[PDB]
């Protein structure tokens, strides 16, 4: 049990670290998805707004 605990603790710590890595990667995806949407629909949708004007004339 001491080893099972160290192993479970390794797993708990692993999971805390894995969760930490994923806390970081979820935030990176939360920020990257955010940034990509924020820049991508905001720019390309803006480019389609610009289409409204670009294709006028």
């Amino acid at each position: 049990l001491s080893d099972k605990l160290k192993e479970a603790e390794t797993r708990a710590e692993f999971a805390e670290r894995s969760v930490t890595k994923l806390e970081k990667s979820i935030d990176d995806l939360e920020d990257e998805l955010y940034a990509q949407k924020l820049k991508y629909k905001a720019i390309s949708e803006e480019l389609d707004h610009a289409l409204n004007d670009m294709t006028s004339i």
Binding site: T10, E13, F14, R17, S18, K21
Partner: protein
């Protein structure tokens, strides 16, 4: 319960031998590549006492034995000791005789050809195996891991081979082999534990350090920052119980040893480490085969079981890699044992039943047949 001529599977390294029968999902037993021999003069008589001890026997009586490992950097040199290990492995724990079963043995793709020729010869002439097949260890991890594609980084006990495989094909020109392995990590740790006041030299001492490494060591993701705190506080130290009840407490040595894999200069080798060898194998492959190897960094063998390694390897390749590409690591629980599992899978494929060297083909051609029939 073996009522069928299933192939036997036995993966033999400088470290451990994994063995069981094809069709299982694990080796039945582990024989730690060892033949032990007494190094002292006997005084009492009628004590039994063997000339040599094999596998777990060598470890159980190791207090007075010198322990010799027959395989160096993944290459069998002491073939007589491997016969002792194989007899013990197959007949005492797997409860089989190779004479009644095909047998699959393994080796790295650039392992000198003499090794695959002897593995084939020994099982046919000493064990009378009806058939043989020498497998690629990189392949076997890919089968176990569910991949046909990826860089297989076999950071084991012997040699790290590093071979890119795409759609089931070898890309051998991109193999980036390193004389960097688990046995160098143990030696490094014996020296840095000496720095702390706990000298390790002899066989019993060497076995302790190997056990310390496997249970206490890790890589983490950032060596310099991990060292900055490990060298400054007891909060990153861990204690280990030595066989005689003494305790060794280990600090940054806990990661400085594993770090050798990323910094081989630690053991005197002119190399940038396993993450650059992994990365270069991707780089050395064709332009339309890199976008798949970046997404498939595949682990094989041991040391892959260090805390922080799955993420550090994905991170290091990502750092070396260009942007846009998706970098991903495959690091399943079938770690440290994926090669054995792959051996079971390969031996059992219907598409592999024609890949076996039969005894008749062997007797007619000789040992060189392994290069005509296996790889």
């Amino acid at each position: 319960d073996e009522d069928e001529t299933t192939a036997l599977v036995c993966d033999n390294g400088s470290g451990l031998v994994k063995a069981g029968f094809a069709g299982d999902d694990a080796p039945r037993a582990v024989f730690p590549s060892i033949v032990g021999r007494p190094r002292h003069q006997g005084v009492m008589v009628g004590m039994g006492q063997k000339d040599s001890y094999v596998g777990d026997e060598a470890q159980s009586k190791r207090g007075i034995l010198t322990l010799k490992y027959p395989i160096e950097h993944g290459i069998i040199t002491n073939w007589d000791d491997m016969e002792k290990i194989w007899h013990h492995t197959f007949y005492n724990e797997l409860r089989v005789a190779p004479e009644e079963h095909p047998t699959l043995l393994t080796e790295a793709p650039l392992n000198p050809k003499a090794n695959r020729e002897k593995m084939t010869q020994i099982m046919f002439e000493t064990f009378n195996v009806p058939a043989m097949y020498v497998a690629i260890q990189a392949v076997l991890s890919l089968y176990a891991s569910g991949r046909t594609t990826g860089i297989v980084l076999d950071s084991g006990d012997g040699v790290t081979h590093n071979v890119p495989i795409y759609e089931g094909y070898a890309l051998p020109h991109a193999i980036m082999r390193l004389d960097l392995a688990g046995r160098d990590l143990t030696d490094y740790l014996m020296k840095i534990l000496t720095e702390r006041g706990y000298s390790f030299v002899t066989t019993a001492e060497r076995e302790i350090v190997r056990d310390i490494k496997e249970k206490l060591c890790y890589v983490a993701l950032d060596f310099e920052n991990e060292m900055a705190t490990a060298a400054s506080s007891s909060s990153l130290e861990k204690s280990y119980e030595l066989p005689d009840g003494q305790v060794i407490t280990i600090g940054n040595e806990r990661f400085r040893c594993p770090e050798t894999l990323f910094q081989p200069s630690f053991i005197g080798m002119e190399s940038a480490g396993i993450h650059e060898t992994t990365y270069n194998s991707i780089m050395k492959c064709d332009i339309d085969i890199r976008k798949d190897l970046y997404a498939n960094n595949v682990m094989s063998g041991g040391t892959t079981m260090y805390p922080g390694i799955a993420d550090r390897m994905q991170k290091e390749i990502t750092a070396l890699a260009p942007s846009t590409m998706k970098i991903k690591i495959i690091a399943p629980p079938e770690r440290k044992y994926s090669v054995w599992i792959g051996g079971s899978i390969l031996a059992s494929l219907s598409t592999f039943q024609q890949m076996w060297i039969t005894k008749q083909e062997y007797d007619e051609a000789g040992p060189s047949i392994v290069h005509r029939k296996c790889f």
